[PDB]
Design a protein around this nucleic acid. Structure first.
Ligand code: MG
Ligand code: MG
Ligand code: MG
Ligand code: MG
Ligand code: MG
Ligand code: MG
Ligand code: MG
Ligand code: MG
Ligand code: MG
Ligand code: MG
Ligand code: MG
Ligand code: MG
Ligand code: MG
Ligand code: MG
Ligand code: MG
Ligand code: MG
Ligand code: MG
Ligand code: MG
Ligand code: MG
Ligand code: MG
Ligand code: MG
Ligand code: MG
Ligand code: MG
Ligand code: MG
Ligand code: MG
Ligand code: MG
Ligand code: MG
Ligand code: MG
Ligand code: MG
Ligand code: MG
Ligand code: MG
Ligand code: MG
Ligand code: MG
Ligand code: MG
Ligand code: MG
Ligand code: ZN
Lengths: 95, 87, 117, 64, 272
RNA sequence: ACUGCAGGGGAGACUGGAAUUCCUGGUGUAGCGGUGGAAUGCGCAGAUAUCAGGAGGAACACCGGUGGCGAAGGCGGGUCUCUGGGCAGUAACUGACGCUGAGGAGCGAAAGCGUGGGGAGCGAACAGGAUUAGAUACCCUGGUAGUCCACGCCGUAAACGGUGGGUACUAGGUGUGGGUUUCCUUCCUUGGGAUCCGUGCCGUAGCUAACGCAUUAAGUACCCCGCCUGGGGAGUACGGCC
């Protein structure tokens, strides 16, 4: 069990209501393997600094998982294959 | 590699008296755990030459301790090999 | 027959030549008269005199299409980089903003071998 | 003279883009160590906070 | 994966063979084997229409499933990896969860015991079949079909793989293994991953008789024939052929694709 | 062994932006490129330029330094996984287990070589142009191997600090990188003093043919290994091993 902080940049054509239950089917992959989820903060719309795949807006979501190494390497795999996800950035918060 | 709650089970099985971390039995039993763990990092990753050199420094330090325990008391050398392995 | 009041002048100034093209802000070329179009041939094209005639020839040929105000985007390590901008002011144009869009690689592709002259 | 060594417990994070509007130039380039007074350890922490903020589109690579 | 013999005979001095390490169950499934017989390059008229075929070891046909249409939502289970004498790839017997046996072309990395999904809601793993609308851009795919429902036709030899490049309106730009860029329909289906046994091109068949086992048959050059037999025939010593190089039927070397064929609206760029 | 701390040490997988080139369209018209000066070349069949989209490869601007890390070779775009070494403090533990090391074994820039990939740019061989008495060169336009990747081989470099490894001692002055700790300690100054390990600069005794070295010795000493014995012939012949 290691801490992580996943930042996902979602496509801005999605609405701000279905942003939370769309990520639940990905964060249920963690809970089937023993890891748990702490803080699913959603920042909302924010202007990007450069254009990512013909989009100038993005939705910022911070995941803050705390799971095994093999499930987080599975979580960003399914996040990359989803079409509503532009970027994915997985970083550790421990030392 | 070899965290603090992982080297205690080696020192209980092989150490002499409940705090003995520096005896020839205690040091060899830790190095054999490090050598046998570093070889799985060298079955995957055949080209990690900067880590295979570290394996040769743990073999050469282990073989000097095996030579030391086979000089001062040959009875301790017999029971230490049979519990770990040689040749 | 194209008519546009606001434009964008691009200047490329190398060690051999200068080229002054004038576009609209959408990026479509109106007039482009360079230092070989104004009559020069060889090493004379790199002189600062050949840059203040290339900028005059592109300016009057752009004012016929209605260009009254440009933006300047110079690039290149040339010596005709400052005299071309002052040549646009003495042709009836307004310069507005002068930018710098010289390409700067982030140590990408390999440069050629250095000259042993 | 370093800010992060005097004022303690201020974590340099790549999320905190308000902290990273300074320590970059007007053209979006990382400032030198001898102009911000940082030490060696925190200049390395500023630079990984800036290089990571560029990959998540919180700071521009180049600007004008 | 490629094993080399030792030179105990003149005919094995540089030979090699596949190691057959990925193969389990050396016998095929009985309810999926159909009979074959070699034609010998002979057509319905009994005449040779393709030279240099003939001979060869006796074979049997394995019913490969290139459709993969009627099992959407039903998982599978890779039971075995077998040999197949009709294609250079390897085959994989699938057990579906309702009892049906099927073969597929085995991808690179589809060991015994994996689970194979199919349909529009499948995962992007090697072995799973999806339409091109659901496969994301950039994925290496194989067993691609040209028309919807028409069965897989592209990229199905050993090591073959197609890179999917984009999806614009109702078409998908593919990069076929030749380098050709072609625009097929997005409702065509395709299996994710590169075809396995991708190391059999380096096999050195050792001797002359070993290509007689595989059905090939010798090839006479045209510069040693007579002029009644080949345009390159004749000569008093030996020649280069007295003319520009042609077929035995006199056709000069050049482009043989029909220049106004009906599929030029789909091809984007020719091979290099 | 325990607790801390710094780092481009290595390996794998995924991945980010600027730029070069090409492709497909938009606008536009006669030049562009190049040099000391030109020419070969590209272009007028729509080039260079300017805008938009797409394909691909390779190297990672700023941070970056006088700096870090590694046994040397060498090492930097980001992230995750696995992994080697080092330093300081505590003095818990073993009780001379140390140093060096003929033969030997491993690692070992670049070029090269084998099989298969990839090939943007650069570029031996190559070709044309110019220069010239000539120009098999310098300079210019092109351009193949190779440079890149995977798995093997080669085992050489001004592989250099032209300085083998370990230890003990012998004035200091002054920068910088990693620790721990005492005094005005909350006068905050992240200044001063002490000590341990790196890394530079200047300097005394001492050494040196001189230049210079000088607590990181080329000083004063002891233990072990390699190597030299006038310059060519020559690191060549023959023999042997790879
Ligand atoms: Mg830090
Ligand atoms: Mg008949
Ligand atoms: Mg034939
Ligand atoms: Mg004959
Ligand atoms: Mg006949
Ligand atoms: Mg004839
Ligand atoms: Mg003949
Ligand atoms: Mg003859
Ligand atoms: Mg590292
Ligand atoms: Mg780009
Ligand atoms: Mg190209
Ligand atoms: Mg064009
Ligand atoms: Mg262009
Ligand atoms: Mg890296
Ligand atoms: Mg004692
Ligand atoms: Mg030694
Ligand atoms: Mg090389
Ligand atoms: Mg050769
Ligand atoms: Mg090669
Ligand atoms: Mg090759
Ligand atoms: Mg020549
Ligand atoms: Mg050249
Ligand atoms: Mg590799
Ligand atoms: Mg080697
Ligand atoms: Mg030598
Ligand atoms: Mg060197
Ligand atoms: Mg030497
Ligand atoms: Mg010494
Ligand atoms: Mg030592
Ligand atoms: Mg010192
Ligand atoms: Mg000195
Ligand atoms: Mg001396
Ligand atoms: Mg002699
Ligand atoms: Mg020799
Ligand atoms: Mg010889
Ligand atoms: Zn600091």
């Amino acid at each position: 069990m290691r801490p992580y902080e996943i930042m996902v940049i979602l496509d801005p054509t999605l609405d701000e209501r279905t942003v939370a239950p769309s990520l639940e089917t990905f964060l249920n992959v963690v809970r089937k393997d023993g890891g748990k989820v702490e803080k699913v903060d959603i920042w909302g719309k924010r202007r990007l600094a450069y254009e990512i795949a013909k989009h100038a807006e993005g939705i910022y979501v911070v995941i803050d998982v705390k799971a095994a190494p093999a499930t987080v390497s599975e979580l960003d795999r399914q996040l990359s294959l989803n079409e509503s996800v532009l970027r994915t950035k997985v970083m550790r918060t421990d030392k | 590699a070899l965290t603090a709650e992982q080297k205690k089970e080696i020192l209980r099985s092989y150490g002499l008296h409940e705090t003995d971390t520096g005896s020839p039995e205690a040091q060899i039993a830790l190095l054999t755990k490090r050598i046998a763990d570093l070889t799985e990092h060298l079955k995957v990753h055949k080209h990690d030459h900067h880590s295979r050199r570290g394996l040769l420094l743990l073999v050469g330090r282990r073989r000097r301790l095996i030579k030391y325990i086979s000089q001062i008391d040959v009875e301790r050398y017999r029971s230490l090999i049979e519990r770990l392995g040689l040749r | 027959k194209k008519n546009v009041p606001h434009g964008a002048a691009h200047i490329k100034s190398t060690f051999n030549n200068t080229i002054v093209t004038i576009t609209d802000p959408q990026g479509n070329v109106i007039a482009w008269a360079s230092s070989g179009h104004v009559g020069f041939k060889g090493s004379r094209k790199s002189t600062p005199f050949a840059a203040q005639l290339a900028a005059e020839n592109a300016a009057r040929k752009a004012q016929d299409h209605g260009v009254r105000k440009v933006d300047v985007f110079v690039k290149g390590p040339g010596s005709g980089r400052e005299t071309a901008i002052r040549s646009l002011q003495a042709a009836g144009l307004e310069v507005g903003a002068i930018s710098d869009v010289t390409p700067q690689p982030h140590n990408g592709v390999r440069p050629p071998k250095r000259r042993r002259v | 003279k370093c800010v992060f060594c005097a004022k303690k417990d201020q974590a340099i994070d790549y999320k905190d883009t308000a902290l990273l509007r300074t320590y970059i130039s007007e053209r979006g380039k990382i400032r030198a160590r001898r102009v911000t007074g940082n030490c060696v350890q925190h200049q390395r922490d500023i630079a990984l906070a800036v290089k990571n903020a560029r990959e998540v589109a919180l700071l521009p690579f180049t600007s004008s | 994966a490629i094993r080399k013999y030792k030179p105990t005979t003149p005919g094995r001095r540089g030979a090699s063979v596949s190691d057959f390490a990925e193969i389990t169950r050396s016998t095929p499934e009985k309810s999926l084997v159909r009979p074959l017989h070699g034609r010998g390059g002979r057509n319905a008229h009994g005449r040779i229409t393709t030279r240099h075929k003939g001979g060869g070891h006796k074979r049997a046909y394995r019913m490969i499933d290139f459709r993969r249409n009627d099992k959407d939502g039903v998982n599978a289970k890779v039971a075995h990896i077998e040999y197949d004498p009709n294609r250079t790839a390897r085959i994989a017997l699938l057990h579906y969860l309702d009892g049906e046996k099927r073969y597929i072309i085995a991808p690179n990395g589809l060991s015994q015991g994996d689970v194979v999904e199919s349909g529009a809601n499948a995962d992007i793993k090697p072995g799973n079949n999806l339409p091109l609308r659901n496969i994301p851009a950039g994925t290496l795919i194989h067993a691609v079909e040209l028309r919807p429902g028409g069965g897989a036709k592209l990229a199905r030899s050993a090591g073959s793989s197609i890179q999917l490049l984009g999806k614009e309106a109702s078409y998908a730009s593919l990069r076929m293994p030749s380098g050709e860029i072609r625009r097929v329909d997005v409702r065509c289906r395709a299996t994710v991953g590169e075809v396995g046994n991708a190391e059999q091109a380096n096999i050195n068949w050792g001797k002359a008789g070993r290509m007689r086992w595989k059905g090939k048959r010798p090839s006479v050059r045209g510069v040693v024939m007579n002029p009644v037999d080949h345009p390159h025939g004749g000569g008093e010593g030996k020649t280069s052929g007295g003319r520009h190089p042609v077929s035995p039927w006199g056709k000069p070397e050049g482009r043989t694709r029909n220049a106004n064929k009906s599929s030029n609206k789909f091809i984007v760029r020719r091979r290099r």
